């Protein structure tokens, strides 16, 4: 059972107001046929337009909420809404567009999906709360057939052009008019009681309902993300590399060792309380400090309450607390914190549920909304590079580095050596990479890098 069988049953109750008299007994085979499509018994990689929940989760980057609301049905104009906030009006002659014929509307759909998805995924997955008109309107902008490759590259074809009779991926589809071999999933098939708004509003207060198609498309995809990533967590699913994943992760490890090593040297804490990932390793293995670990998985729903993490059914005020990607409601004053900023715009960070975001880097992690009040007892950690390694070149060109934040023996004694200048510029690069990826660094208010210069005597 790799793909969804076309002979699987489809509950049609959600479709009977737009489609009166719809048979209660219905398969994907008959539904696809009713949508105007013909599969012709094809063993060419596209077995079903509809996919399983497991296949949807593996392709979460391809999710596009899609809803159709009749304005006035081949006689009436339809309002097409996408979770990108777009609203197109198609006439059969929250960005709102006036009524236009299908032949131009379809050109807009290809442009929009291609610009949204080219850097996220090899496909589109239409996430639906199916009532009828979205499924019947698909014949006006979708073409299906065997799996194909792009005319200009080796990626799979996601668009077709009737003008040139050719196929293209999301990167080479300028001027293409048809969505080719899209996927889709109906959230109503998962077994919900009540309408979309009642189920969405149980977990999310950020998305409202103006009553436009895009508000529904947004609520649909948000509810799907809550079911698949907030209340159900699968950290075994691996996602492909689509950007700077490897560099961001390497940078995170470099920054962690640096910031923690310098806090232990500056304030000489006797104990460090490492709260977070149960698979954590000591980031500063040579530090003298008593290292104590506390297990707390990444919270995907609401941020951890510090009152529950610290409750003993043990002296957290002694030494320092390390919360590296451990999202709590209010950090204690003696803390070193890395907190992912859910507001960040990137190909890795997808929109989420209740203000949160879906950070996808090797694994998918729904992160609770960034909250500035979490850090009231702390301050923003400033950039600095620290090194006690010998000043020795070994082995790229050079311009002399002058910086007040290069905390080294060579800078203390006047001129920064070539080694520490190379290492400083590489560390600053990793630092900017981690910050731009969305991570934010916070530290206890007494943290002062002036205390690092005396470690050179
Ligand atoms: C470190 C505090 N502690 N002791 C037992 C269990 C826990 C965690 N909070 C529930
Ligand atoms: Zn291409
Ligand atoms: Zn929502
Ligand atoms: Zn040096």
UniProtKB/Swiss-Prot annotation:
Functional note: Plays a role in viral RNA synthesis through two distinct activities. The N7-guanine methyltransferase activity plays a role in the formation of the cap structure GpppA-RNA. The proofreading exoribonuclease reduces the sensitivity of the virus to RNA mutagens during replication. This activity acts on both ssRNA and dsRNA in a 3'-5' direction.
Domain ExoN span(s) in chain numbering: 49-230
Regulation of this protein's activity per its record: Inhibited by Remdesivir antiviral drug (GS-5734).
Catalytic site: 67, 69, 134, 211, 216
Oligomeric and partner information: Interacts (via N-terminus) with DDX1. Interacts with nsp10.
Binding site for Zn(2+) 16: 391, 410, 417, 420
Location(s) in or outside the cell: Host cytoplasm; Host endoplasmic reticulum
Part of the whole protein covered: 5949 to 6449 of 7096
UniProt-annotated binding residues for Zn(2+) 14: 150, 153, 169, 172
Stated name of the protein: Guanine-N7 methyltransferase nsp14
Highest classification ranks of the organism: Viruses, Riboviria, Orthornavirae, Pisuviricota, Pisoniviricetes
Residues reported to bind S-adenosyl-L-methionine: 274-280
Residues annotated as binding Zn(2+) 15: 200, 204, 207, 222
Binding site for Mg(2+) 2: 69, 211, 216
Annotated catalysed reactions: a 5'-end (5'-triphosphoguanosine)-ribonucleoside in mRNA + S-adenosyl-L-methionine = a 5'-end (N(7)-methyl 5'-triphosphoguanosine)-ribonucleoside in mRNA + S-adenosyl-L-homocysteine
Annotated region (GpppA-binding), positions in chain: 353-367
Record-listed Mg(2+) 1 binding positions: 67, 134
Residue ranges of domain N7-MTase in the record: 239-457
């Amino acid at each position: 059972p790799t793909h969804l069988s076309v002979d699987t049953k489809f509950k049609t109750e959600g479709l009977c107001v737009d489609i009166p008299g719809i048979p209660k007994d219905m398969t994907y085979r008959r539904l696809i046929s009713m949508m105007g499509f013909k599969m012709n018994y094809q063993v060419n990689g596209y077995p079903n337009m509809f996919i399983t929940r497991e296949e949807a989760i593996r392709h979460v980057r391809a999710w596009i909420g899609f809803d159709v609301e009749g304005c006035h049905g081949t006689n009436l104009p339809l309002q097409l809404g996408f979770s990108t906030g777009v609203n197109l009006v198609a006439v059969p002659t929250p960005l709102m567009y006036k009524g236009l014929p299908w032949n131009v509307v379809r050109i807009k759909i290809v442009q929009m999906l291609s610009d949204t998805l080219k850097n996220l995924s090899d496909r589109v997955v239409f996430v639906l709360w199916a009532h009828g008109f979205e499924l019947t309107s698909m014949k006006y902008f979708v073409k299906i057939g065997p799996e194909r490759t792009c005319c200009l590259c080796d990626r799979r074809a996601t668009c077709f052009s009737t003008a040139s009779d050719t196929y293209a991926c999301w990167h080479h589809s300028i001027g293409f008019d048809y969505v080719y071999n899209p996927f889709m999933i109906d959230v109503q098939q998962w077994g919900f009681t009540g309408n979309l708004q009642s189920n969405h509003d149980l977990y999310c207060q950020v998305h409202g309902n103006a009553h436009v198609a895009s508000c529904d498309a947004i609520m649909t995809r948000c509810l799907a993300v809550h079911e698949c990533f907030v209340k159900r967590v699968d950290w075994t699913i691996e996602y492909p590399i689509i950007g700077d994943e490897l560099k961001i992760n390497a940078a995170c490890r470099k920054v962690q060792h640096m910031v923690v090593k310098a806090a232990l040297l500056a304030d000489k804490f006797p104990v460090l309380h490492d709260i977070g990932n149960p698979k954590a390793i000591k980031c500063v293995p040579q530090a003298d400090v008593e290292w104590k670990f506390y297990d707390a998985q990444p919270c995907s729903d609401k941020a951890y309450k510090i009152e529950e993490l610290f409750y003993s059914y043990d002296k957290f005020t002694d030494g320092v607390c390390l919360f590296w990607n451990c999202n709590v409601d209010r950090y204690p004053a003696n803390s070193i914190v890395c907190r992912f900023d859910t507001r960040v715009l990137s190909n890795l960070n997808l929109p989420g549920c209740d203000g949160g975001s879906l950070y996808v880097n090797k694994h998918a992690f729904h992160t609770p909304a960034f909250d500035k009040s979490a850090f009231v007892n702390l301050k923003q950690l400033p950039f600095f590079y620290y090194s006690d390694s010998p000043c020795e070149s070994h082995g790229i060109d050079y311009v002399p580095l002058k910086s007040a934040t290069c905390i080294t023996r060579c800078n203390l004694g006047g001129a920064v050596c070539r080694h520490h200048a190379n290492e400083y510029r590489l560390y600053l690069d990793a630092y900017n990479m981690m910050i731009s990826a969305g991570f934010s660094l916070w530290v206890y208010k007494q943290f002062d890098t002036y205390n690092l210069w005396n470690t050179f005597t």
